[PDB]
Tab-separated table of C-alpha atoms and ligand atoms in Angstrom:
chain	number	residue	atom	x	y	z
A	1	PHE	CA	0.805	9.038	24.924
A	2	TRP	CA	4.275	6.377	24.929
A	3	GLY	CA	2.751	6.518	20.565
A	4	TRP	CA	2.266	10.153	19.825
A	5	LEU	CA	5.133	9.211	16.985
A	6	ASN	CA	2.386	7.699	15.184
A	7	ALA	CA	0.695	10.729	14.455
A	8	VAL	CA	4.693	12.669	13.781
A	9	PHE	CA	5.891	9.508	11.346
A	10	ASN	CA	2.595	9.440	9.963
A	11	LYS	CA	2.166	13.174	9.145
A	12	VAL	CA	2.202	14.456	5.812
A	13	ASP	CA	4.567	17.306	4.074
A	14	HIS	CA	3.269	18.810	1.774
A	15	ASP	CA	6.419	21.461	0.854
A	16	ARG	CA	8.969	18.378	0.691
A	17	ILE	CA	6.384	17.212	-1.508
A	18	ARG	CA	6.103	20.469	-4.010
A	19	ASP	CA	10.020	20.211	-3.300
A	20	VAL	CA	11.521	17.202	-4.163
A	21	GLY	CA	8.253	15.253	-5.831
A	22	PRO	CA	5.536	12.882	-4.759
A	23	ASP	CA	7.720	9.546	-4.801
A	24	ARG	CA	10.901	10.926	-3.175
A	25	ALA	CA	8.239	11.705	-0.088
A	26	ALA	CA	6.719	8.520	0.073
A	27	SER	CA	9.321	6.785	0.172
A	28	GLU	CA	10.917	8.975	3.583
A	29	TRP	CA	7.135	8.430	4.484
A	30	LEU	CA	7.088	4.193	4.730
A	31	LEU	CA	10.296	3.468	5.128
A	32	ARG	CA	10.765	5.689	8.203
A	33	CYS	CA	7.408	3.462	8.844
A	34	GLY	CA	8.657	0.080	8.380
A	35	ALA	CA	7.711	-0.473	5.124
A	36	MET	CA	10.694	-0.364	2.188
A	37	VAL	CA	9.917	0.498	-1.815
A	38	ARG	CA	10.830	-0.391	-5.309
A	39	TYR	CA	11.762	1.585	-7.922
A	40	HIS	CA	11.219	1.708	-11.680
A	41	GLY	CA	14.513	0.027	-12.457
A	42	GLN	CA	15.703	-1.461	-9.932
A	43	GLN	CA	16.313	-5.041	-8.025
A	44	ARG	CA	17.781	-3.752	-4.723
A	45	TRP	CA	14.933	-3.322	-2.355
A	46	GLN	CA	15.244	0.235	0.061
A	47	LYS	CA	15.040	-1.100	3.144
A	48	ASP	CA	17.576	1.543	5.196
A	49	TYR	CA	15.968	4.904	4.921
A	50	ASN	CA	19.486	6.628	5.685
A	51	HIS	CA	20.288	5.042	1.954
A	52	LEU	CA	17.735	6.767	0.092
A	53	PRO	CA	18.989	8.553	-3.321
A	54	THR	CA	18.310	11.781	-2.781
A	55	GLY	CA	21.246	13.535	-5.605
A	56	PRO	CA	19.720	11.816	-9.112
A	57	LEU	CA	17.061	14.222	-9.654
A	58	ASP	CA	13.818	12.740	-10.089
A	59	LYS	CA	14.272	9.827	-11.874
A	60	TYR	CA	13.077	6.846	-9.972
A	61	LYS	CA	9.461	6.580	-10.002
A	62	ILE	CA	7.513	3.545	-7.079
A	63	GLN	CA	6.330	0.794	-8.355
A	64	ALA	CA	6.281	-1.463	-5.088
A	65	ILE	CA	6.045	-1.067	-1.919
A	66	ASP	CA	6.543	-3.437	0.934
A	67	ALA	CA	4.886	-3.092	4.348
A	68	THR	CA	5.417	-5.302	6.333
A	69	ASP	CA	5.653	-4.664	9.703
A	70	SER	CA	4.753	-1.193	9.385
A	71	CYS	CA	3.594	1.688	10.923
A	72	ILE	CA	2.005	3.597	8.396
A	73	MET	CA	-1.869	4.440	9.317
A	74	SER	CA	-3.853	6.732	6.752
A	75	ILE	CA	-3.839	10.044	8.100
A	76	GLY	CA	-0.814	9.001	6.557
A	77	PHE	CA	-2.188	7.656	2.399
A	78	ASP	CA	-1.770	11.719	1.817
A	79	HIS	CA	1.782	10.830	0.686
A	80	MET	CA	-0.215	7.500	-2.669
A	81	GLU	CA	-1.793	10.233	-4.354
A	82	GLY	CA	0.880	12.305	-6.655
A	83	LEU	CA	1.997	7.990	-7.572
A	84	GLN	CA	1.438	7.518	-11.377
A	85	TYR	CA	3.154	3.716	-11.556
A	86	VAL	CA	2.849	1.816	-8.525
A	87	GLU	CA	2.594	-2.251	-9.192
A	88	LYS	CA	2.734	-4.101	-6.430
A	89	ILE	CA	1.523	-3.603	-2.803
A	90	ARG	CA	1.839	-6.234	0.198
A	91	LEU	CA	0.297	-5.811	3.206
A	92	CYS	CA	1.712	-7.552	5.800
A	93	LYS	CA	1.028	-8.221	10.257
A	94	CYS	CA	0.094	-3.469	9.865
A	95	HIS	CA	-1.627	-3.401	12.548
A	96	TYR	CA	-2.996	-0.187	11.641
A	97	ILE	CA	-4.740	-1.173	7.678
A	98	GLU	CA	-7.900	-1.582	8.355
A	99	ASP	CA	-11.115	-1.197	6.040
A	100	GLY	CA	-11.060	2.462	6.199
A	101	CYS	CA	-7.343	1.728	4.144
A	102	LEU	CA	-8.294	-0.021	1.584
A	103	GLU	CA	-10.748	2.755	0.430
A	104	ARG	CA	-9.294	4.909	0.402
A	105	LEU	CA	-6.222	3.333	-1.257
A	106	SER	CA	-9.053	1.471	-3.625
A	107	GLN	CA	-9.984	5.646	-4.790
A	108	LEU	CA	-6.895	6.356	-5.163
A	109	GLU	CA	-7.758	6.952	-9.867
A	110	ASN	CA	-3.783	7.320	-10.359
A	111	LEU	CA	-3.367	3.760	-8.930
A	112	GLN	CA	-6.448	2.285	-10.412
A	113	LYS	CA	-4.352	2.215	-13.380
A	114	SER	CA	-1.590	1.251	-12.842
A	115	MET	CA	-1.672	-1.892	-9.717
A	116	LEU	CA	-1.378	-5.036	-11.242
A	117	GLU	CA	-0.210	-6.960	-8.374
A	118	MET	CA	-1.981	-6.935	-3.994
A	119	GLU	CA	-1.168	-9.205	-1.253
A	120	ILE	CA	-3.343	-8.539	2.191
A	121	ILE	CA	-1.312	-11.051	4.645
A	122	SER	CA	-2.029	-11.405	8.673
A	123	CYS	CA	-3.843	-7.705	8.860
A	124	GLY	CA	-5.703	-8.143	11.853
A	125	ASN	CA	-8.587	-5.664	11.222
A	126	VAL	CA	-8.939	-6.091	7.805
A	127	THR	CA	-12.556	-6.674	6.835
A	128	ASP	CA	-14.679	-8.533	3.686
A	129	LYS	CA	-15.454	-4.678	3.327
A	130	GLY	CA	-12.329	-3.723	2.970
A	131	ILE	CA	-11.240	-6.304	0.547
A	132	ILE	CA	-14.504	-5.475	-2.030
A	133	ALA	CA	-13.541	-2.246	-2.172
A	134	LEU	CA	-10.041	-3.969	-4.662
A	135	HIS	CA	-12.324	-3.728	-7.296
A	136	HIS	CA	-11.834	-0.784	-8.456
A	137	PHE	CA	-8.312	-2.030	-9.785
A	138	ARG	CA	-10.062	-1.886	-13.041
A	139	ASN	CA	-6.455	-2.921	-13.884
A	140	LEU	CA	-5.280	-5.641	-10.624
A	141	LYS	CA	-4.115	-8.939	-12.504
A	142	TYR	CA	-3.265	-11.127	-9.345
A	143	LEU	CA	-4.826	-11.039	-4.999
A	144	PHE	CA	-3.316	-12.407	-2.325
A	145	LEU	CA	-5.994	-13.235	1.040
A	146	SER	CA	-4.215	-14.344	3.922
A	147	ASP	CA	-4.657	-15.311	7.165
A	148	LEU	CA	-7.533	-12.285	7.579
A	149	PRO	CA	-9.430	-12.858	10.693
A	150	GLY	CA	-12.154	-10.320	10.138
A	151	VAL	CA	-13.335	-11.296	6.745
A	152	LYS	CA	-15.691	-13.410	7.297
A	153	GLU	CA	-18.378	-13.989	3.632
A	154	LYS	CA	-14.818	-15.251	1.543
A	155	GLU	CA	-16.451	-17.312	-1.205
A	156	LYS	CA	-19.032	-14.073	-1.911
A	157	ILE	CA	-15.838	-12.605	-2.072
A	158	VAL	CA	-14.881	-14.733	-4.706
A	159	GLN	CA	-17.875	-14.301	-6.862
A	160	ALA	CA	-17.900	-9.883	-5.836
A	161	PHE	CA	-14.863	-10.524	-8.347
A	162	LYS	CA	-15.385	-13.168	-10.758
A	163	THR	CA	-18.093	-10.276	-11.756
A	164	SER	CA	-16.048	-7.141	-11.540
A	165	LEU	CA	-12.505	-8.832	-12.606
A	166	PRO	CA	-13.323	-11.594	-14.256
A	167	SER	CA	-9.674	-12.738	-15.416
A	168	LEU	CA	-8.111	-11.781	-11.465
A	169	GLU	CA	-6.469	-14.554	-9.875
A	170	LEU	CA	-6.942	-14.308	-6.972
A	171	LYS	CA	-4.618	-16.764	-4.319
A	172	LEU	CA	-6.529	-17.400	-1.273
A	173	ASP	CA	-5.791	-18.523	2.074
A	174	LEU	CA	-8.230	-18.209	4.776
A	175	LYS	CA	-9.626	-20.301	7.766
B	1	LIG	MG1	8.246	-2.579	9.295
């Protein structure tokens, strides 16, 4: 219904993966959902889906992800599985991101190593539960929560992190 496309765009094309390998596949899913990515090695952000590197075989790993105004959703997070090197993620004004998404991510082993830096800005459906789940990123050096109206017991988050990730810089920007 006037938006089935969301399912089409979030579909996971395991064939494509196995062909051109996870990072490439995940860059197509992302940019086609109005996200951007940045490969280890470059300063340029990939932002135009049609300009994606389609030659230099299998050298581009994904390192930072910017979902602003994006239409990604958890039925598609299988794209995030075989990603070895992701260090940054920014989620901002993404309507369909919420607690379930944050769980799924925070349970991706490959990401639990690689992640250093996360920001959740202005995503209305996320909550305290979703946030706390983020402790499983054992290497997370910094995490910015801003404009998250679904988050209530802030202070209690600050504690959980204080204990389970003692040296995480934890910028807050909450009501
Ligand atoms: Mg966008």
